[PDB]
Structure 1
């Protein structure tokens, strides 16, 4: 029980939408995010993430089972159509 704030940009848009998804941050998946958008497949989804060796990246994630990178209840995403 809990919610996650997903902040997402659609293509070249300057200002993202913020949506609250009623899945707690500890377990929110790409599948959870997709259910809320229902985007024509096949958008590609990138998320603000940390790479062990490199530092901050926009990580592409296409596996519905994959957990999304969160910080303080928040996910930050970029969509490409």
Structure 2
């Protein structure tokens, strides 16, 4: 009964998908469970980072056990297909 807002941009599509997810943290594996289609993707998430000239970078996450970065109180991902 406690939550973070997860939203991702999927394989190009410019309107993103948003949805509520339960529990103070989210991991890449939890995130991967939201995806509707199967296959091989790379996963990037918006994240603030002081060593880049305009603040943000999209961090790649590979391991399901990882905690996903948070940005402006949301989780924001780009999901990209390995062509």
Indicate the TM-score class for this superposition, using the shorter chain for normalisation: 0.7 to 0.9
| CA-CA distance at 1:48 after TM superposition | 0.5
**Paired residues of 1:48 and 1:75 also in contact (CA < 8 A):** yes
Matched ranges for 1:34-73 at <5 A: 34-37=32-35, 39-54=37-52, 55-73=55-73
**RMSD between aligned alpha carbons?**
1.8
Structure 2 spans left out of the alignment, 5+ residues: none
| CA-CA distance at 1:77 after TM superposition | 0.5
TM-score (norm 1): 0.81
**Paired residues of 2:47 and 2:71 also in contact (CA < 8 A):** no
Does residue 3 of structure 1 match 2:7? no
**Paired residues of 1:6 and 1:18 also in contact (CA < 8 A):** yes
**Paired residues of 1:28 and 1:67 also in contact (CA < 8 A):** yes
Structure 1 spans left out of the alignment, 5+ residues: none
Whole-Å separation in 2 of the counterparts to 1:43 and 1:10: 10
Larger Rg: 2
| CA-CA distance at 1:22 after TM superposition | 1.3
TM-score (norm 2): 0.79
Structure 1 residue runs of 4 or more that deviate by more than 6 Å after TM superposition: none
Question: Which segment is superposed worse, 48-57 or 8-17?
Answer: 48-57
